[PDB]
Design a protein around this ligand. Sequence first.
Ligand SMILES: [Mn+2]
Ligand SMILES: [Mn+2]
Ligand SMILES: [Mn+2]
Ligand SMILES: [Mn+2]
Lengths: 296, 296
Amino acid sequence: TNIFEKRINLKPYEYPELNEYVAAIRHSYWIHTEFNFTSDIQDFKTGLSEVERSAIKNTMLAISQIEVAVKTFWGDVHHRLPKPEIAAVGATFAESEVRHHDAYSHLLEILGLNEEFKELKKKPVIMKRVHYLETSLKHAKSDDDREYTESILLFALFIEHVSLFSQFLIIMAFNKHKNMLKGISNAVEATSKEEQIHGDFGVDIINIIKKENPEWFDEEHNNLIKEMCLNSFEAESKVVDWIFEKGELDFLPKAVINEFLKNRFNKSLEAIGLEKLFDIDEALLQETEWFDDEII
Amino acid sequence: TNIFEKRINLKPYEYPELNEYVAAIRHSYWIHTEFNFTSDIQDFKTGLSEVERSAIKNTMLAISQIEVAVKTFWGDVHHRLPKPEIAAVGATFAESEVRHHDAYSHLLEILGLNEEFKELKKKPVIMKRVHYLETSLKHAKSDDDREYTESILLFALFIEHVSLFSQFLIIMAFNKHKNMLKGISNAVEATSKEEQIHGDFGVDIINIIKKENPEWFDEEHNNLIKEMCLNSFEAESKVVDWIFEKGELDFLPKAVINEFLKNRFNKSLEAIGLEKLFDIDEALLQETEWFDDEII
Ligand SMILES: [Mn+2]
Ligand SMILES: [Mn+2]
Ligand SMILES: [Mn+2]
Ligand SMILES: [Mn+2]
């Protein structure tokens, strides 16, 4: 098998196991119109202290920075990985991103955050985030399979599996602790599950590429993956600092969120056979174990 | 205002009305696992005469010739029509085609038609159908916007709005008259509604292209569209002859199916401002009015 080459017959599948990702998204499928956000609008308006409102506002803006955008990467994977089973997953994933866009676009509207969203791009922390996101996808349109592989790798391991996860954690933790933001936490939980599925497929694709082209993955390029991992963590850790610019939440300190992120980065590296990059404080990490127990 | 030109900023939308197509497919969304085909399997095995079974088998094979294939045209429209609103529709449509593929692939399996499906491509009537289908999409990957426009036009007006519709009509008519093939007619009705939506969006895209580039739609190019309309009808009319090779169904004669097809071809031409091509026998057309009353 060669993942990069087109095949003559539709059947049999060369990577039949990838078909499970279509079933996974059909099971996770959701539209924001299934949730009721009336209490969330009221909570955001009058139920929060100024510290809590600033944290929630910034978290919603940070999710939207990624979700409220044109996201065609998954829908285009078939051009460079021309397999029917990959094209099926890619199309299923591309549609799920349209559902995410509509959900967060609706949430910015009803929370009265459209003007703040338009001005978000001017923030240095956001520009720094955009830099690592654009660098990660610099080869998304490359004619070289090895360069394109770098884009899949960084996109799946770090963007899909980690970029939004401090934000998903903040919303879920807020609902778990305060029983507020019911509709938003439902939408966030549904988005988390789909991003987890997106990254898992990308991890599987990378392991197929690595199995078929082991010589592309030397100690040298493994060091290049590790420095991109560090850049992603530093940028996301700074986004966390900005989210809590008006004060930390006592039940979810930044130190707890940072350990949660480092662990996700480690798991992404380990998923493709690399060694872990971050030393983990187990006691601080334990505080967020409930998140993965919910997402699965 | 140019449909072919990239707009990086998400809002304001240039064609906000195209968003209705994403909501239309979310409303029509279905998976074959929502239907029960147990009675259909039994009907196909023991409930049909030799004439009826041959007609149903050939109809299912003809639907599958189009549906059981990699269908990435809709998911790629954004490359040449780089608008966020178009990209959202394209991704939603590309996913619906994966659902259609899984549905008809499941139906070929449970009806024991996998081997007959593998050999279908060798039939002269099928080769003749493939010829007009491939000719219609010959410019699907062109760098010239005018040539690409020809592919969208033929694909939407004739392939999406008509190619499968004699088959959808045959299945629904069989269920209406005989109260058999319950699950299959449900899946066919659900597919018909989504193909109707697919072609409607394509018609809207063509009318935007025609509004922005009226000089592209000259008498010479309109004559080519009419010549392609005739080629599509002749090939689909021959597919109908093949479906009924073992005998016609008294309740749905070929003359009735052919008038149904000619009328659909006329409506596609009229939808983009071209004149009707076929003379219609109104009495024979009236016999299939119930079909559009169900789909629309
Ligand atoms: Mn998303
Ligand atoms: Mn994703
Ligand atoms: Mn279809
Ligand atoms: Mn279609």
